[PDB]
């Protein structure tokens, strides 16, 4: 089963898994999309793609999403992983010029993806493809919000570059602000809306209960990744991890830091369960008997429901994905699925 140091019985008992019915087609289609966009080598796609469970992760998250919405999300999510991989490889191989150029290309492509569908850099071209498809579901105000959020995410990745180049391990709270961006908290929160087929008015999505529930879902996911990816990231000289920040700055041992991380991870679960009642109560309040009210009520309920799904999907993803199976690699510093 799941290692005791990563065991979360509450998740296993109170957060039952869910799987989108489109998943089987999703797994094959994203794999095809990875190949035809040349984002991974053909033989690495063959050997590793399905084992990475990227599609599985998303299909256990955005339940109720239209098939084409889930597809665009999965393709984007898969791109996000290979972006993390080249971000890592640029740092290790010390390719600062290449990173800065990619950084500039991503910013530009984010606002104008159509112009970049056939850019020479395949990573850019793949990004433009998934982003443009994501822009075809909801009004431009949502597209603008997604872009504004991802612009921040890119710069967050640039901060990580400069931290790792200089060996700077961020302070605990410095990291926590940073982790909200490098994990793309608000992208995932944004994508809840096209999954339920409705852009929420600011007044609804900025409701304190919605805000708190959305945050707690992402804080759990990010910090659990830190807990589970810690072995691979130490071996890979990654410095961005709550466990690492606690060791470096609070003189915690490895054993102590792991215990501290899971406690914070567990606080997320119980805090979420509290505010989930508030968020769900808010959903009931939106249903005032009007058509518009019924729409907003249903959207919020689905979204909060998927905030909950994020817990279970992320939890099992870290135990099923080959991305974190560092023990099974010849070279622990270089993941076999990574373009080296
Ligand atoms: C690894 C990068 N990722 C996924 C693409 C987005 C920043 C975080 C993540 C890791 C593991 C599970 C869910 C999200
Ligand atoms: Mg990483
Ligand atoms: Mg990273
Ligand atoms: Mg990680």
From Swiss-Prot:
Give the gene name.
Answer: cyc1
E.C. designation(s):
4.2.3.37
Keyword terms of this UniProt record: Lyase, Magnesium, Metal-binding
Which amino acid positions bind Mg(2+) 1, per UniProt?
A: 84, 88
The protein here is known as Epi-isozizaene synthase
What is this enzyme's class at the first EC digit? lyase
Checking InterPro entries in the record gives:
Isoprenoid_synthase_dom_sf, IsozizSyn, Terpene_cyclase-like_2
PANTHER family (UniProt xref): BETA-PINACENE SYNTHASE-RELATED, TERPENE SYNTHASE
This protein's pathway reads:
Sesquiterpene biosynthesis; epi-isozizaene biosynthesis
Q: Which organism is it from?
A: Streptomyces coelicolor (strain ATCC BAA-471 / A3(2) / M145)
Which residues take part in binding Mg(2+) 2? 84, 88
């Amino acid at each position: 089963a799941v290692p005791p140091s990563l065991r979360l019985p509450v998740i296993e008992a109170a957060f039952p898994r869910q799987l989108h019915p489109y998943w089987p087609k999703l797994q094959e289609t994203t794999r095809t999309w990875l190949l035809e966009k040349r984002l991974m080598p053909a033989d690495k796609v063959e050997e590793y793609a399905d084992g990475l469970c990227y599609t599985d992760l998303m299909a256990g998250y955005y339940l109720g999403a239209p098939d084409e919405v889930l597809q665009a999300i999965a393709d984007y999510s898969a791109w996000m992983f290979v972006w993390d991989d080249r971000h890592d490889r640029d740092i290790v191989h010390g390719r600062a010029g290449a990173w800065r150029r990619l950084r500039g290309l991503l910013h530009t492509a984010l606002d104008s993806p159509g112009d970049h569908l056939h850019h020479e850099d395949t990573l850019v071209a793949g990004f433009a493809d998934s982003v443009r498809r994501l822009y075809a579901f909801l009004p431009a105000t949502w597209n603008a919000r997604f872009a504004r959020h991802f612009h921040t995410v890119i710069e967050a990745y640039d901060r990580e570059f400069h931290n790792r180049t200089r060996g700077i391990v961020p302070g605990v709270e410095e990291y926590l602000e940073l982790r909200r961006l490098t994990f793309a908290h608000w992208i995932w929160t944004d994508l809840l809306e096209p999954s339920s087929g409705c852009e929420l008015p600011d007044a609804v999505r900025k409701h304190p209960a919605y805000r708190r529930a959305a945050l707690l879902s992402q804080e759990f996911a990010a910090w659990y990744n830190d807990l589970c990816s810690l072995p691979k990231e130490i071996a890979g000289d990654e410095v961005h991890n709550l466990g690492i920040s606690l060791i470096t700055h609070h003189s915690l041992t490895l054993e102590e830091a792991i215990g501290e991380v899971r406690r914070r991870v567990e606080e997320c679960i119980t805090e979420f369960l509290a505010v989930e009642r508030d968020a769900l109560r808010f959903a009931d309040e939106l249903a005032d008997g009007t058509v518009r009210g019924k729409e907003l009520s249903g959207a919020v309920r689905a979204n909060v429901g998927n905030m909950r799904n994020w817990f279970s999907s992320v939890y099992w993803f870290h135990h099923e994905s080959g991305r974190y199976m560092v023990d099974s690699w010849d070279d622990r510093s270089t993941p076999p699925y990574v373009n080296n």
